[PDB]
Write an enzyme that holds these catalytic residues in place. Structure first.
Site, short mmCIF file in Angstrom:
data_model
loop_
_atom_site.label_atom_id
_atom_site.label_comp_id
_atom_site.label_asym_id
_atom_site.label_seq_id
_atom_site.Cartn_x
_atom_site.Cartn_y
_atom_site.Cartn_z
CB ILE A 1 -1.18 0.00 1.17
CG1 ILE A 1 -0.44 -0.15 2.44
CG2 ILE A 1 -2.00 -1.30 1.05
CD1 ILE A 1 -1.42 0.16 3.63
CB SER B 1 13.54 7.09 2.34
OG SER B 1 12.78 7.63 3.26
N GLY C 1 11.39 1.79 3.46
CA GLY C 1 11.07 0.28 3.26
C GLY C 1 9.64 0.59 2.78
CD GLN C 2 8.69 -3.30 0.53
OE1 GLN C 2 8.68 -2.91 -0.56
NE2 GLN C 2 9.37 -4.58 0.87
CE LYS D 1 8.15 3.40 9.14
NZ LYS D 1 8.46 4.35 9.82
CG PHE E 1 2.02 1.09 12.78
CD1 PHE E 1 2.20 1.99 13.85
CD2 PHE E 1 2.99 0.65 11.97
CE1 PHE E 1 3.30 2.53 14.21
CE2 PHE E 1 4.40 1.18 12.28
CZ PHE E 1 4.63 2.30 13.45
CD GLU E 2 -4.70 2.74 15.25
OE1 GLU E 2 -5.76 2.66 15.78
OE2 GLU E 2 -3.75 3.75 16.06
CG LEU F 1 -4.61 4.79 11.08
CD1 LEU F 1 -3.81 5.74 11.51
CD2 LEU F 1 -5.90 4.81 11.78
CG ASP G 1 9.16 14.04 7.84
OD1 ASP G 1 9.39 15.27 6.97
OD2 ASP G 1 9.02 12.94 6.89
#
Ligand SMILES: Cc1nc2ccc(-c3cc(N)nc(N)c3)nc2n1CCOc1cccc(Br)n1
Length: 333
Positions: free
Chosen positions: A24, A28, A30-31, A47, A97-98, A100, A146
């Site tokens: 999804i 930088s 990763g994915q 992540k 993570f949840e 979102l 960020d």
């Protein structure tokens, strides 16, 4: 074993628990993949950190800061994304993570970049200032480093409840490790000037993000640091001489004269691009598309503008803090 991205296969199942659905997003670090957690019977966003030492170490600080926040009894900690758990898998650190919804930039794009109602801007602003208040908690003192529309996600597409993500440039007060942090458009002048920073840099980003949210345009759209700083000066004028006096990168943008004052080097004049006019305070809002419309009185625009200018203070010391920002007349019901 080749390359530093995990070879994610669509549909494959990990540790007999997570069924990968789809990639999804990249980046930088990763994915991020969508995956079903058969054990907790819920959709999770994993992540996947690049198998690279620099990104591994940075992720490891993300995990600590996330495990610090998601152990505080506050209810303000529901503006920060929930870290369910993390694991090592195929030599990649995976943060779970949840799930979102889409980010505030996808939201802007949904409106053909016309921006959202000042009324919806306020809801985002109150939520973000409360998160920032949560991050300023003494035992935390976390700096996101960020903030941008991209790192502000909706919980559901229908509701205006937001959460912050990406603590991968994140640090605590005193633990500053990058000289170059933030996304350019939302990068505070102190970081541009190369100075030591605190949480006040996130309030700067917020101000920029809020104006963008309502005008659908970045406030300071700099191609580089010199363009970035120049764009800020266009609106806010020349920074306090007392700041450039300590500024390591002062001379990248400004010059001191014999008089002991600073000005620019070899654009609109400093402070002559009034935010007031950017917002269309008196000419029916950004592009004039809020003319006559409810909750968009000159009065409403003035209160927002005042709060924005308190967020965009050059001085990190006098710049407004989450607690005082929430007490601002922009929020009173
Ligand atoms: C759909 C979705 N839910 C998420 C929950 C958490 C995170 C999440 C992502 C990152 N980099 N760092 C943390 N700590 C959490 N990313 C989620 N995404 C993906 C769509 O947003 C985003 C946001 C940022 C980057 C990317 Br790619 N994509």
């Amino acid at each position: 074993p080749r390359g530093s991205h995990m070879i994610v296969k669509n549909g494959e199942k990990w540790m007999d628990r997570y069924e990968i659905d789809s990639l999804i997003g990249k980046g930088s670090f990763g994915q991020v993949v969508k995956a079903y957690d058969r054990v907790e019977q819920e959709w999770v966003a994993i992540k996947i950190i690049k198998n690279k030492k620099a990104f591994l170490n940075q992720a490891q600080i993300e995990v600590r800061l996330l495990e610090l926040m998601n152990k505080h009894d506050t209810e303000m900690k529901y503006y920060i994304v929930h870290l369910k758990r993390h694991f090592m898998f195929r030599n990649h650190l995976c943060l779970v993570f949840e799930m979102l919804s889409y980010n505030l930039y996808d939201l802007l794009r949904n409106t053909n970049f016309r921006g959202v109602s000042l009324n919806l801007t306020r809801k985002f602003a109150q939520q973000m200032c409360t998160a920032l208040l949560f991050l300023a908690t003494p035992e935390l003192s976390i700096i996101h480093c960020d903030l941008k529309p991209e790192n502000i996600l909706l919980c559901n597409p229908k509701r205006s409840a937001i959460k912050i993500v990406d603590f991968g440039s994140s640090c605590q007060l005193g633990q500053r490790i990058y000289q170059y942090i933030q996304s350019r458009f939302y990068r505070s002048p102190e970081v541009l000037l190369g100075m030591p920073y605190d949480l006040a840099i996130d309030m700067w980003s917020l101000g920029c993000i809020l104006v963008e949210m309502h005008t659908g345009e970045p406030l300071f759209s700099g191609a580089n640091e010199v363009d970035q700083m120049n764009k800020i000066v266009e609106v806010l004028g020349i920074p306090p001489a007392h700041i450039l006096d300590q500024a390591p990168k002062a001379r990248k943008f400004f010059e001191k004269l014999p008089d002991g004052t600073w000005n620019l080097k070899k654009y609109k004049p400093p402070g002559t691009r009034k935010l007031h006019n950017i917002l269309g305070v008196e000419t029916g809002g950004p592009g004039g598309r809020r003319a006559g419309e409810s909750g968009h009185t000159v009065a409403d625009y003035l209160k927002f503008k005042d709060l924005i200018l308190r967020m965009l203070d050059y001085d990190p010391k006098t710049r407004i803090q989450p607690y005082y920002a929430l007490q601002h007349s922009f929020f009173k019901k």
